[PDB]
Design a protein around this nucleic acid. Structure first.
Lengths: 116, 196, 116, 152, 42
RNA sequence: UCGGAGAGAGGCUCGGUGAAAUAGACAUGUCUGUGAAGAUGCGGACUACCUGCACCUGGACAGAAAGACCCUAUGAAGCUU
RNA sequence: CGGUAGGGGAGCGUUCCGUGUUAGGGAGAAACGCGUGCGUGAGCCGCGUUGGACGAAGCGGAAGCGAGAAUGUCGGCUUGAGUAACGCAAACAUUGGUGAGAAUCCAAUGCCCCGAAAACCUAAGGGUUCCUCCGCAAGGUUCGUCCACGGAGGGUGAGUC
RNA sequence: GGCCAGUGAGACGAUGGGGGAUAAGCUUCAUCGUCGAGAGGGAAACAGCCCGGAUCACCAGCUAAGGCCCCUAAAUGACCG
RNA sequence: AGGGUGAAAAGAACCCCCAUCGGGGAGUGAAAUAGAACAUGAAACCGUAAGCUCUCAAGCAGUGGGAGGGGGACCAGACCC
C-alpha cells in the first residue's frame, strides 16, 4: 500500500500563503519563507494586543493632561485624578479623554464643580 | 483630446458632487452627538481627520528670547510645536502650532557655558571634527544655537523633520511674519527669565 | 592623450593602414565610385586629393611619385592624360561622401565615395 | 464585451530570439499607428525587428483580408513577448569542467485594434453629463466608455 | 569576485528597464530618419 | 634615482551570439556604545533625493576545499626492533 | 493551567480493504484553483467556474501515512547579466554574381602570409567524412544562399604496388 | 514497590574558604538565588542584577520594582539644607 | 532518460501574410480556451492589463493604531484592496 502524498501538502501551504498575501517582496510568494514569516506576524499580533491596552491608556492620559492644564495656571493631571477620587467619581480615562475631545464644555463643567 | 477631456471633466465634477453628499464633517467647538450618527466616534478613541488639522488653520506664536534661558524656553517651544499644548493631541500627526523666535543672539545661559560649551559637527572625514564654543559660534551664526537646541528636543524620525520646519529663528528683533498675526507664547516656569 | 593629433587609424597598424588606403585609392580611381564604411571613406580624402593634385603637374618625377603609390600602372596612366582636362577648373576637393544605411551583419556605418 | 470585434490576435510563435532582446523592440511599439510602426521597424538597427516586422505586416494583412477594415485606421493595442521552449547545448571550458549555453526562444503575440469601429457610439456621447437617455431600460453604452463605470 | 546574495527581483527589473530605454532611444532616432528619407537630401 | 613617450592585443562604445563560480530572505549608511567579549540588522547620535556607467578593492569574520597544524577516537594504514 | 530534554492523555488527516457492483455522479465525480461558514487545532463544510469520470459518509480495519532543514536526492526554473568571453598580433580590400536576405557563399582583380611548411605522398587510426543534386529546424562560439551538418543517389577495378 | 525516561559539558551573583598575584567574564569545593527551561516591567541597548511567575478575551481599574524639564507615561510639586 | 489528440485521422480541401517556418479565416469534430510542442495542467520563474501608492529617505520588512484614495450588475455604522 504505497501512499503518495500529493493533495495534503499545498492544500495547507495555500492557507499558509493566504495570510501572507499582503506582504512585500519575497515574503509573499516563497513557500518556506512564507512559513517562516507567518509565524512572526502572528507573534507580533499577539504581542501588540497587550501593548495596545497600555498604550491607548497612555494616550488618553496625555489627552486629559493637555485638556486640564488649560484651566488654572497651577492645575495638573496628577492632582485632577486624586480630586476625582476625593469626591468618589468612577469615570475611567477613556470617557474622560474622549469627552475632552468631543465636548470640552463637559470637561469645563466637571472641572467647575469638582473644586468647590 | 479636447472633446474627451472636457467630457471627462464634466463627469469627474458630477461624481465628485455625488459623494460630497453622502456624510458630513464638522470642525471643533461642537456637541457630543449630532445628526451624523454614522460609525462610532464615541467608544472608539478619537483620531484626527485631515479636514481638521490643515496648515493654514494652525496657530502661531512669537518668543522674544532676550535675557532668557536657552533650555527652558526650548522645552516649551518643543511642546507647542508638538501639540501637547492641545487637548486634541495625537502622536502620529502634527496638530501643533508654529513658533517664531527673535533676538536669538541675545539668549542667555547659566554657569560658565558661554566659554566651556562646545558645539561639534564632524564633516564625515578621517580628520574633520570641527568644534567651536557657544559665544564664538554666536558671533558668527546665532540662529543655530536656538535651532539646534530645539531640534534636539523634537522627536527624531520622518515627522521630526517635517515639524522642525515650523520653527523660525532670527538674528534681530524685527520679523517678517506680520501677516499671520502671531500671538505671544505662554510660559510655564519660574526659572525661565534670568535673575536680572 | 590625442590632443592635436590628426591621423585616421582605420583600426589597424601602419603595415595595413597604408595597404588599405593604397588599395582603396586604386579601386576608387579605377571604378569611380565605391561603397565602404564612413571611416574608411573619410580617411581616404587626403590620398585621392593628393594624387589628383599630383596629376596636375604631369612630369617624369610626379608620375613616379604617383606610381610608387597606386600599384597598378595602367590606372595612373589614365590619370595625367585625363585629369587636367576634366579637373583643370577645379581647385582642390575632388571627392564626395554620400552616406547610406548600415551594413547588415555588424551594424557597421556605411558610405559611398566617388570622384566629384 | 467592451471590444471583442476591435482586434485580431495574430500570434506568430517559436521565433528563435531571446525574450529580452525582443522586449527591447516591442516595448516601443505598444500603442502606435501601424503605418508609423512599419517605418520604424525597417530603419531600426536590430536583428530583433525582422521577425517582428513580418508579424506586424502579416497581422495587418490578416486584418484587412479576414475582418475587412482599413490599415490606416488600426493601432497595436497589446504587444506581448513570452518565454518559449529552451534548448541546452553543453559546451566545454578550461580544465575539464563543462557549462551549458542555452538557445532561447520566444512566443510573440500582437493584438491590433481599429480606432473608429465604436466611434459612432463614442462621438454620440459628446452629449454632456446629466443626460441618462433611458430608451431600452439602459441600452448600448457598450463601446469603451473609458473614463468611468460609476453605474450604482 | 563573487556575489553574496541574489538581486532576486525588482532591482533586476530596474536594471533591465534602462537597457530597454536604450532601445527606445534608438527607435526615436530611426523614426527621425524616415522623414529625412522622404524628400530632398542633395 | 624618476619617471616619460609611442606601436600592437585587450579594456571603452555600437551591432550579433552569449557563459560562470555564488545566492536563508534581503527595503544591504558613518560614528561611538552594546552583545557569544570585532554589528547594514540592537541603543544613542550623526550623515544622507532616486537611478545608471566607468574606474578602485577596505569590509560583507567575501568565494573556493565538513583544517592538511593542534588534539580527540580503546579509528585506518605504512615503516622499525 | 510558563516551560527545553523528557513522560502521560485526547484527537485530525493520507491511501488502500470490509460494509458496497450503496447514493451521489456527462442536468458534471476525482482533481485544480477561491470562500464576509464552522473548530482549541490538525482539519471540516457549502460554493459555481476550469475539468472530464469516478466515487461520500457512518461504523470498523491496515499501513511504502503527514516534511523546511540531512554541503539530502531527482526534476524544473532563477540570480550573477544582456555582463565575461567569441581560441594568437598572417590581412585583408574592392567590383560583379547568386538570393527573400551576403563583412562571412562563388567569380575576378589587387594586397598580404606560409614554403625542412601552413607543400605533395605514404604507415597507424578513423570508418563513408570522398563525389553529385537538394535542404537549412538543430550542429558551426556571429551570419550563412555555405559545410567534415541533414536528406537522396553514386564512388575504391591489380599476375608485377 | 511495579512499568518506563532524560540527565551525567553547566553558567553567573551573594556568602564561607582553598589555588592564583587575597589578578581574571580565571579555577575548585561548600551553602542559597536566577538563568538554564521564564515571557512581562525597571536597568539607554544588556542570559545570569531588581520586581514579578505569561490558561484566554476587555479601546476598564489598583499597584511592585523604578520614576514625574523635552525626546518619552506621570509635580517646570512643596519646605529645609 | 524519454508513456496518455480523438469515439473515429474526420490530422485541417480552399483563401489571405508568404522563399520557408509558422500564423489568421474556412472546413471537420461533442470540444481545436482537443491542432500534432496536441488529455487534467499546481508552484517557482517570465510577462501584459487595471485600482491605489513611493524620488529627505534609515529599512528581518511585519505588527497595533490608521490619514487620503479606490470597490462588488446585490441600497452595510458591514466587508475587501
Amino acid at each position: 500500500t504505497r501512499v503518495k502524498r500529493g493533495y495534503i501538502a499545498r492544500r495547507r501551504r495555500k492557507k499558509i500563503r493566504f495570510f501572507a498575501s499582503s506582504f512585500r517582496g519575497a515574503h509573499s510568494r516563497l513557500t518556506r519563507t512564507i512559513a517562516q514569516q507567518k509565524i512572526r506576524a502572528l507573534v507580533s499580533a499577539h504581542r501588540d494586543r497587550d501593548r495596545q491596552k497600555r498604550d491607548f491608556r497612555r494616550l488618553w492620559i496625555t489627552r486629559i493632561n493637555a485638556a486640564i492644564r488649560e484651566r488654572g495656571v497651577y492645575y495638573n493631571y496628577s492632582k485632577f485624578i486624586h480630586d476625582l477620587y476625593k469626591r468618589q467619581l468612577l469615570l475611567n480615562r477613556k470617557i474622560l479623554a474622549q469627552i475632552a475631545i468631543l465636548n470640552p464644555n463637559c470637561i469645563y463643567m466637571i472641572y467647575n464643580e469638582i473644586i468647590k | 483630446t479636447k472633446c474627451t477631456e472636457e467630457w471627462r471633466q464634466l463627469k469627474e465634477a458630477v461624481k465628485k458632487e455625488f459623494a460630497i453628499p453622502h456624510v458630513p464633517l464638522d470642525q471643533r467647538w461642537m456637541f457630543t452627538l449630532e445628526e451624523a450618527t454614522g460609525p462610532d466616534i464615541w467608544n472608539t478613541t478619537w483620531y484626527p481627520k485631515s479636514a481638521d488639522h490643515v496648515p493654514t488653520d494652525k496657530k502661531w506664536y512669537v518668543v522674544d528670547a532676550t535675557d532668557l534661558i536657552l533650555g527652558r524656553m526650548a522645552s516649551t517651544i518643543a511642546i507647542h510645536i508638538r501639540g501637547k499644548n492641545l487637548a486634541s493631541y495625537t502622536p502620529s500627526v502634527d496638530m501643533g502650532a508654529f513658533v517664531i523666535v527673535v533676538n536669538a543672539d541675545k539668549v542667555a545661559v547659566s554657569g560658565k557655558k558661554r566659554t566651556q560649551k562646545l558645539y561639534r559637527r564632524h564633516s564625515g572625514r578621517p580628520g574633520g571634527l570641527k568644534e567651536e564654543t557657544f559665544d564664538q559660534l554666536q558671533k558668527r551664526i546665532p540662529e543655530r544655537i536656538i535651532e539646534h537646541a530645539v531640534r534636539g528636543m523634537l522627536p527624531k524620525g520622518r515627522l521630526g523633520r517635517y515639524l522642525f520646519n515650523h520653527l523660525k529663528v532670527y538674528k534681530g528683533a524685527e520679523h517678517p511674519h506680520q501677516a499671520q498675526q502671531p500671538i505671544d507664547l505662554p510660559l510655564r516656569d519660574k526659572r525661565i527669565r534670568v535673575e536680572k | 592623450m590625442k590632443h592635436g593629433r590628426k591621423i585616421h587609424r582605420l583600426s589597424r597598424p601602419a603595415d595595413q593602414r597604408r595597404a588599405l588606403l593604397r588599395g582603396l585609392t586604386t579601386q576608387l580611381l579605377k571604378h569611380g565610385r565605391i561603397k565602404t564604411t564612413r571611416a574608411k571613406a573619410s580617411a581616404m580624402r587626403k590620398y585621392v586629393d593628393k594624387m589628383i593634385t599630383l596629376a596636375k603637374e604631369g612630369s617624369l618625377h610626379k608620375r613616379r611619385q604617383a606610381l610608387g603609390f597606386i600599384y597598378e600602372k595602367q590606372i595612373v596612366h589614365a590619370l595625367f592624360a585625363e585629369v587636367p582636362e576634366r579637373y583643370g577648373d577645379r581647385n582642390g576637393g575632388y571627392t564626395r561622401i554620400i552616406r547610406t544605411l548600415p551594413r547588415r551583419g555588424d551594424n557597421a556605418p556605411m558610405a559611398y565615395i566617388e570622384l566629384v | 464585451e467592451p471590444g471583442k470585434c476591435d482586434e485580431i490576435t495574430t500570434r506568430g510563435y517559436s521565433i528563435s530570439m531571446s525574450v529580452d532582446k525582443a522586449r527591447r523592440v516591442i516595448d516601443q511599439i505598444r500603442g502606435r499607428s501601424y503605418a508609423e510602426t512599419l517605418m520604424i521597424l525597417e530603419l531600426m538597427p536590430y536583428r530583433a525587428c525582422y521577425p517582428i516586422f513580418k508579424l506586424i505586416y502579416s497581422a495587418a494583412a490578416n486584418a484587412s483580408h479576414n475582418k475587412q477594415f482599413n490599415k490606416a485606421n488600426l493601432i497595436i493595442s497589446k504587444a506581448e513577448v513570452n518565454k518559449g521552449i529552451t534548448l541546452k547545448k553543453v559546451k566545454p571550458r578550461a580544465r575539464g569542467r563543462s557549462y551549458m549555453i542555452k538557445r532561447p526562444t520566444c512566443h510573440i503575440t500582437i493584438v491590433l485594434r481599429d480606432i473608429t469601429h465604436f466611434d459612432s457610439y463614442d462621438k454620440f456621447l459628446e452629449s454632456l453629463t446629466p443626460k441618462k437617455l433611458i430608451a431600452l431600460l439602459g441600452l448600448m453604452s457598450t463601446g469603451r466608455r473609458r473614463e468611468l463605470l460609476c453605474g450604482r | 569576485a563573487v556575489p553574496k546574495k541574489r538581486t532576486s527581483i525588482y532591482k533586476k527589473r530596474i536594471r533591465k528597464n534602462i537597457w530597454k530605454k536604450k532601445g527606445y532611444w534608438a527607435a526615436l532616432k530611426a523614426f527621425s530618419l524616415a522623414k529625412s528619407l522622404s524628400t530632398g537630401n542633395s
